[PDB]
Amino acid sequence: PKPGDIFEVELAKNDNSLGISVTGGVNTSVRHGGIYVKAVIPQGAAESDGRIHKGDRVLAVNGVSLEGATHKQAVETLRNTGQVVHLLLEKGQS
Amino acid sequence: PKPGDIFEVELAKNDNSLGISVTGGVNTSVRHGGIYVKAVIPQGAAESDGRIHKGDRVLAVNGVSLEGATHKQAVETLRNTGQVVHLLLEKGQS
Amino acid sequence: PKPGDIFEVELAKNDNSLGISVTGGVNTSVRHGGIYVKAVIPQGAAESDGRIHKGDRVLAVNGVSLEGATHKQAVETLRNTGQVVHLLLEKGQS
Amino acid sequence: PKPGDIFEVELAKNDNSLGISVTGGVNTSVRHGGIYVKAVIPQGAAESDGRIHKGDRVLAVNGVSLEGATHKQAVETLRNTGQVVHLLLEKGQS
Amino acid sequence: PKPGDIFEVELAKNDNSLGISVTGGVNTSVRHGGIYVKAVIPQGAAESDGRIHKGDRVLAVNGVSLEGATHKQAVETLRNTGQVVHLLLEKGQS
Amino acid sequence: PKPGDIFEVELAKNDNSLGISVTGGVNTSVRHGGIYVKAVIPQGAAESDGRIHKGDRVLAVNGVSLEGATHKQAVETLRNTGQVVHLLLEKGQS
Fold this sequence. Notes:
6 copies of one chain form a homohexamer. Chain A is of the alpha+beta class.
């Protein structure tokens, strides 16, 4: 994808983690309060898969929008998932 | 989804089980012979994922309709899959 | 698709009709009480498209299951759509 | 869909209009700057289709995110499309 | 999409044309015997839609691969469709 | 699917393998340089899943076309993936 493009992934966890950290939330001044990929963890699931990078916006998890989520809630939403997770993203770096 | 809506999931097994029991089949008097989720097994894959609930109808597995399946046939169709399974469902009533 | 396979189409109406007649519904003795394609109307939209054939089962319209529909209800659901309609189907026999 | 659910539509224009008006954008004082459906025009494309309503958020158009878009920019993004437009939404009216 | 990316479009015809011309086929010496977009016709459907460009590869039409098609067969496959057509493409080089 | 149909799968690895061996690539004399399933490994991931068979063509991996791939490039593309891999295929003859 190009920056700005929507894309979706079915991401399998490794070590029961998606291998990303997130930044943002409505409680934050992070732009518009969105949830963004802060970092892909070395040798983690996201990195091995290769489609998600720092800067991508996480729009939804398993069919549910993250709109209105505080940081705590976004993290919890990502954790409260099974071994394969459906993620909807916008490609960052535009 | 709301009751009646179509949804799809890619569900990873836990210890080779999707963690759902089903009821129904053409051989039964259940509704019109359809395959429905009887229970989401505690601690299982379907429960962790959080999208599938008791009463949802399973319409297809890995791209093949369950039409005409007996109960036994549906159970075996669900078992005879790999580690991640594509499921097409209709959301049940609350 | 082969018989039994799930497929979907986005079908544009010709002169406000999808060009399919249906058979079945829970008030009939058509198998499983399902809604099936009775005919692909000559010169109509479904015929021109080429993917839908007599005997295919219509599972959903614009994201909403036809589960439990009477014949009349199914016909209305098809008719109460805009110009392009999303249809979910099961490929029929022979 | 339930409020908060992601959904997508392929919507055909009527009289070269999708038959919805929008509110919001980065510059505006509305809802985190996101783009929301303000109204569905009577007899219009979106109304006939029946899947989009006031309050839904428009996440993307033809594969491209509306993220960071101003009002004018969003309104034009919607206009510079062809006869059928792919829309990604979040169901509103919690 | 970036060059090499898969993308899909539901394209409504304008004046009964998709507004694209193609090059290639197993009877030509075009690379891989593939079918490529030769031109997008000014003011046509593809151009208004904005997602398809010269050099993109057409992988499939309405669910069917163009693998092994001669040039005339590819053209006919494109023509022998309804008012809205599902196209699977690979993004070409710019 | 029928021969020539497009299908997609989300395939989970078993013991870090997709359970398929492929043949072809631009450097080979196989077909028109495409990447094809040579075998599915007994008791492996692809076999258990049941949708991919010898002769199917792999068109893309995780959203990126295998156009122009040498064999070694194709294999590396398959390997440089996470635990669940999105594959786009054309159903082979028979």
